[PDB]
Amino acid sequence: MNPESRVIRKVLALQNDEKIFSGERRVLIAFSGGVDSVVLTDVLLKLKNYFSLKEVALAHFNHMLRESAERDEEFCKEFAKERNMKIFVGKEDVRAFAKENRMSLEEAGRFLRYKFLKEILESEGFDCIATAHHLNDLLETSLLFFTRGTGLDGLIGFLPKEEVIRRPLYYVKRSEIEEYAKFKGLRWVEDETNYEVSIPRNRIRHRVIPELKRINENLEDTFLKMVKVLRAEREFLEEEAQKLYKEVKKGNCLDVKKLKEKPLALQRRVIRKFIGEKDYEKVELVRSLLEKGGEVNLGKGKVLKRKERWL
Amino acid sequence: MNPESRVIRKVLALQNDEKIFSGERRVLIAFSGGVDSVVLTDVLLKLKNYFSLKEVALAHFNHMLRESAERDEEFCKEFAKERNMKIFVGKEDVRAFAKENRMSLEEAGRFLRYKFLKEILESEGFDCIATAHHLNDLLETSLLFFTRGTGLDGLIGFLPKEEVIRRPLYYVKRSEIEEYAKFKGLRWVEDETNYEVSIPRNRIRHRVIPELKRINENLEDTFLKMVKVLRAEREFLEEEAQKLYKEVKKGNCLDVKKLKEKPLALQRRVIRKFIGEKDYEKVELVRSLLEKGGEVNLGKGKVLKRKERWL
């Protein structure tokens, strides 16, 4: 069990558990140039036949943030040539966009980068986008929702497969990725992504997580188990909320005399769906109309018409 | 809304909702002497009739850990005397007990203290014990579970009503406990309870939470909404699980053909209660039997035979 097979085993296990690839023929990689990116690529090129892929291409986005950006682009191009892959390069001033839209560098960078990735996907005929997102990114994302406000969804964080996007390194942790690259003698760059990181995420990455790991050395392995438990529990809650939904709904209304007799958890789930809103505040405000007539406005109206309810 | 009504409204909301008190007539307060204790007591004296309580008494435990122990105990006796309340006092050499049983001062302290409280509950005829555990304590516990590994049942932390123990301040924030004390002129003394706090818990209390608050200064309020949401989802899971348990559990084995088709989330809950030991790796190991399996071992054994066993 060396650094290489440790990653490959987790990638293959993800495929068996989620069917990341199941018909796609042309994959576009979100290639920033960092270790994550390089290892993802080295892995996909190694398992290309295994997944029945016909084309794996790179897409590098130049954020114009710093001089190293040009250095990054050059590395990406040379990397494409050494690997004999096609590469698509894009460019947009992220810092500028962030300022005229009163948003952070992280969300501006994310927005422009994927806009670019998605444009190449359509004008070049790709079936999906492979991202180097991993277990440590998931842990950081989970902790950021715990901190800012969340329910089961935020805690579980992003999924391995998500409409057009694929995250093959989902089970792999940052350190295993670094050990993979060193072991195989790969080369990488400190891509511009490191300089867009939001302050909240840096606090969690370089201050909170290190402290938590001093309590539990294998935080990532432990966290992954929580995610798996949470995802099965969420799946169950969703399946049940759905049965009750198509059992209490009729037209554009909800049978209040039926819903009210159900478990609190399902009452909220049914309501979340019926009104397309996750806000803890809006859900409960609407939920109260299950016990006392009245109306609720969110930009749409919910009236209690004896036993029924519209919106 | 002043500092008093801010705490009382949260306590009232807890009662009218979960019935923390529903028949108990005599309550024993775990009175350390610090703000938490002092405020808990003041709140229970104000709501004593509302809760239909006949008597509220104090119980103070001297840990003999600091030369201020006697002054502290005296303060507690005078606290009771002034409000015409009964107070029970305990005293144990926690250091000696810790060395004797090879345990830390923290776990030794907590052990002896609760033994003391429970001894009084029985020999004096009290119905329940009221503790000053609040929202910040829950937040701490929640992060500890996130860190050491858990699922849904741990992210919650503890409950407001836990057999014999009641926690009226469940939803109250520490800062609200302190403002209440100031506003009402409540004086307090050193809280020996803080000598029962372990290293990991101190790290989360003094290092992690303060950092997370530099992201969301309203963390506690945010965490509250999450608890209320998860809390209900857990109740529903626990509910559906127990239900399934009786249907599959028959004698001392599990109807595999039937359990095998239930949702993954419920399978884990049933197994957790069947094999007593609830640990991700144990449960998953056993759950592998349901679908074409041989036999597994741990502290006991189990065999798949169209039905199920346990030897």
Swiss-Prot record, chains A, B:
Record's catalysed reaction(s): cytidine(34) in tRNA(Ile2) + L-lysine + ATP = lysidine(34) in tRNA(Ile2) + AMP + diphosphate + H(+)
Gene Ontology MF terms: ATP binding; tRNA(Ile)-lysidine synthase activity
Entries under Pfam families matching the protein: ATP_bind_3 (PF01171), TilS-like (PF22132)
Cell compartment(s), UniProt: Cytoplasm
EC number from the UniProt entry: 6.3.4.19
Keywords: ATP-binding, Cytoplasm, Ligase, Nucleotide-binding, tRNA processing
Function statement: Ligates lysine onto the cytidine present at position 34 of the AUA codon-specific tRNA(Ile) that contains the anticodon CAU, in an ATP-dependent manner. Cytidine is converted to lysidine, thus changing the amino acid specificity of the tRNA from methionine to isoleucine.
Name by which UniProt lists this protein: tRNA(Ile)-lysidine synthase
Encoding gene per record: tilS
